[PDB]
Design a binder for this molecule. Structure first.
Ligand SMILES: *[C@@H]1O[C@H](CO)[C@@H](O[C@@H]2O[C@H](CO)[C@@H](O)[C@H](O)[C@H]2NC(C)=O)[C@H](O)[C@H]1NC(C)=O
Ligand SMILES: *[C@@H]1O[C@H](CO)[C@@H](O[C@@H]2O[C@H](CO)[C@@H](O)[C@H](O)[C@H]2NC(C)=O)[C@H](O)[C@H]1NC(C)=O
Ligand SMILES: CCCCCCCC/C=C/CCCCCCCC(=O)OC[C@H](O)CO
Ligand SMILES: CCCCCCCC/C=C/CCCCCCCC(=O)OC[C@H](O)CO
Ligand SMILES: CCCCCCCC/C=C\CCCCCCCC(=O)OC[C@H](O)CO
Ligand SMILES: CCCCCCCC/C=C\CCCCCCCC(=O)OC[C@H](O)CO
Ligand SMILES: CCCCCCCC/C=C\CCCCCCCC(=O)OC[C@H](O)CO
Ligand SMILES: CCCCCCCC/C=C\CCCCCCCC(=O)OC[C@H](O)CO
Ligand SMILES: CCCCCCCC/C=C\CCCCCCCC(=O)OC[C@H](O)CO
Ligand SMILES: CCCCCCCC/C=C\CCCCCCCC(=O)OC[C@H](O)CO
Ligand SMILES: CCCCCCCC/C=C\CCCCCCCC(=O)OC[C@H](O)CO
Ligand SMILES: CCCCCCCC/C=C\CCCCCCCC(=O)OC[C@H](O)CO
Ligand SMILES: *C\C=C(C)/C=C/C=C(C)/C=C/C1=C(C)CCCC1(C)C
Ligand SMILES: *C\C=C(C)/C=C/C=C(C)/C=C/C1=C(C)CCCC1(C)C
Lengths: 296, 296
């Protein structure tokens, strides 16, 4: 099917390659198989199921709330492109050093990272304002993806360096994301809302932790995984990272706003020490509205 | 110098290209000259002068304030890479459809866009908090760059579509950036500070407006500009966009903080109508501290 040169002849006992003078790019590296038919079959099924979850989440959100819809919007447009041109440039970049770079993956990441990280900075949906910490999260995360994308396009020691630079930015991101979730947990009402925040923390760190793991394992790293293999891995953590997390988000938001509808905005002053942090604890009792220094 | 195949023989009256079977990538498209020696000379001079401004701004900032230093930090690291490997992959991506994509340019943009846009949302340096508008600026701007990078990697009608998607996100960004500058102007003290804000608005819209212009003019568009030609253009708007703007930023910040040191934080309530906006006008008179509905 390809729109680079696929047809060639070996000459002088395979010391010379002859190609038609048709102006097409040529590299043997590009023509390596993308994997087994079993890997491909598994990947096409998980993609449809991802399309289905993306489709149902959107209609569901149809019944504030912009971050979840957008990630499903970007996710559906992703599947229509995958369906028609998953292995066409520039969904994959076939480059001069022989690399295959899945631009489709990294593009989606850069697009939605501020959406996800704004949503991280707005779990309750009650804030109209964002602290200095939000801004450090966005700067560090975008650096991470830019270094990582550079690492995927590179080879040898240059790939190693950009990966290392991605990891250092990433560590700063994970550290600060942890404090946000801690604050969120002690902010929301004591019941179901704290189960959902806990659910979102698990989904976030496991799914986000799996991306640098799949980088090292894929063609961009030590080439352990095939391309279809990588796609299957990506579909699973994609479902967790995007659809499910925003669905849990929307659910949390509903619970919090309904708390204001029934009990009202009854905040507290839980002074944490996990340092010298502070928090506004929503409670279901009007009585409870004082300073609770819970030094952790 | 190149690390793709540069040496080939024409066979059967130029209907066949023969290349050594050494596993190197090959495309005639990659081997087109990057421009005249005059263009190259001009580009190397402006780069050194950019290195010099980046170097002096950093030492100058050495005598809160993190956004300006970082853009100069990223800018210096950029020049050391340019000096050694400006036309080596992945500073340039040479891809299977024959495109040259200046990844070095787009990477820097993605890295510093949250830094610049946070700084846009913090001209005075007095805010500890960021409004909902900041977040829309970051989402729209990152979309713009991701669509544009996709457009640069693509060809034909797919390049047209991604450019159009970049422009639509871009328009939303420019619209909202305009409101920020309006708010900033009517927030800062009446004297020198409003000259600097006005200076920053001009630099921002002219420099940022010139990027989609240089895209359309370069190899990524209608190929009017050569590669060295594009580099020269980029150096000029780079100096404006990064060094100069952050220097004017730092200067503004100094002026505002010194206002708190002399007069103190004396805010007002200028209710604008350019809609139904509001602003906290810093003044040098303790007397002045009331609601001034200045409907524009
Ligand atoms: C054609 O080139 C091939 C290179 O593979 C040569 O085949 C091999 O020759 C070397 C001997 O120098 C052996 O070590 C290998 O075991 C051979 N086979 C393979 C599969 O590598 C072959 O000798 C060359 N023929 C001519 C006429 O030069
Ligand atoms: C070698 O191929 C070239 C293709 O350029 C042929 O040269 C041209 O031939 C056509 C005639 O069909 C003319 O229209 C052009 O003006 C010729 N010159 C150029 C520079 O394009 C040439 O005929 C071929 N030779 C053989 C033996 O097939
Ligand atoms: C914050 C979450 C915690 C979890 C974070 C996950 C840690 C994964 C890192 C592994 C280090 C090993 C080095 C990896 C270097 C990758 C670059 C590479 O593959 O290099 C190609 C090689 O040079 C040519 O074959
Ligand atoms: C907000 C600031 C205001 C200023 C904003 C600047 C506007 C520039 C747009 C021009 C439209 C013309 C169409 C440009 C399409 C670019 C894609 C392209 O070059 O297409 C390649 C072609 O298909 C193969 O040769
Ligand atoms: C895990 C992959 C998704 C579920 C398994 C479906 C599949 O691909 O199984 C085909 C079988 O292995 C025939 O080769
Ligand atoms: C997210 C980013 C999208 C990548 C763009 C992928 C879109 C695939 C376009 C296919 C293409 O390159 O079109 C060539 C043409 O259709 C055949 O002659
Ligand atoms: C060391 C890696 C650099 C870490 C990545 C950059 C950190 C984010 C940043 O620039 O934020 C600084 C800010 O002053 C925080 O309060
Ligand atoms: C914190 C203090 C500054 C040191 C940080 C980064 C060093 C990496 C510099 C980038 C070198 C890129 C070249 C490459 O080979 O990759
Ligand atoms: C504008 C470019 C920077 C200033 C001009 C320097 C330059 O390149 O001029 C060389 C001359 O044209 C010899 O061909
Ligand atoms: C900003 C992004 C940086 C792009 C990375 C550019 C760094 C250039 C590295 C050069 C390279 O590819 O190294 C190959 C090797 O040194 C020769 O055998
Ligand atoms: C039409 C292009 C889409 C515009 C790009 C996306 C807009 C940014 C966004 O998602 O923000 C929505 C938010 O609800 C704002 O208050
Ligand atoms: C707002 C409502 C939704 C419509 C917006 C975008 C259409 C673009 C869809 C992306 C198609 C990419 C394929 C390409 O050819 O580029
Ligand atoms: C589409 C949704 C999500 C959540 C995408 C997330 C991507 C990452 C978390 C990537 C992380 C990286 C790290 C931490 C370091 C190596 C380079 C990566 C970009 C792969
Ligand atoms: C390094 C500093 C700056 C300010 C870089 C800015 C880059 C842009 C403003 C790019 C804008 C684009 C637009 C508006 C639409 C087409 C695609 C572009 C990414 C080139």
């Amino acid at each position: 099917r390809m729109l680079f040169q696929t047809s060639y002849t070996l000459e002088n006992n395979g010391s010379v390659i002859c190609i038609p003078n048709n102006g097409q790019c040529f590299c043997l590296a590009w023509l390596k198989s993308n994997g087994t038919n079993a890997e491909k079959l598994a990947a096409n099924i998980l993609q449809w199921i991802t399309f289905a979850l993306s489709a149902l989440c959107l209609m569901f959100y149809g019944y504030c709330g912009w971050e979840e819809i957008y990630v499903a919007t970007i996710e559906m447009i992703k599947f229509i492109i995958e369906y028609f041109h998953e292995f066409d440039e520039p969904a994959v970049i076939y480059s001069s050093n022989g690399n295959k770079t899945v631009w489709l993956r990294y593009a989606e990441w850069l697009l939605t990272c501020p959406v996800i990280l704004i949503h991280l900075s707005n779990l309750t949906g009650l804030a109209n304002d964002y602290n200095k910490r939000t801004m450090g999260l966005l700067v560090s995360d975008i650096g991470t993806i830019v270094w990582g994308t550079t690492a995927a396009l590179s080879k040898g020691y240059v790939r190693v360096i950009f990966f290392l630079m991605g990891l250092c930015y990433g560590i700063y991101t994970f550290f600060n994301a942890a404090k946000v979730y801690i604050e969120a947990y002690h902010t929301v009402p004591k019941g179901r809302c704290r189960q959902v925040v806990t659910g979102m923390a698990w989904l976030f760190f496991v799914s986000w932790g799996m991306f640098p793991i799949l980088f090292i394992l894929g063609p961009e790293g030590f080439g352990v995984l095939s391309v279809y293999g990588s796609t299957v891995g990506h579909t699973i953590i994609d479902l967790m990272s995007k659809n499910c997390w925003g669905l849990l988000g929307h659910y949390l938001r509903v619970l919090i706003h309904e708390h204001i509808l029934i009990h009202g905005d009854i905040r507290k002053t839980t002074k944490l020490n996990i340092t010298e942090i502070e928090v506004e604890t929503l409670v279901e009792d009007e009585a409870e509205a004082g300073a609770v220094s819970s030094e952790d």
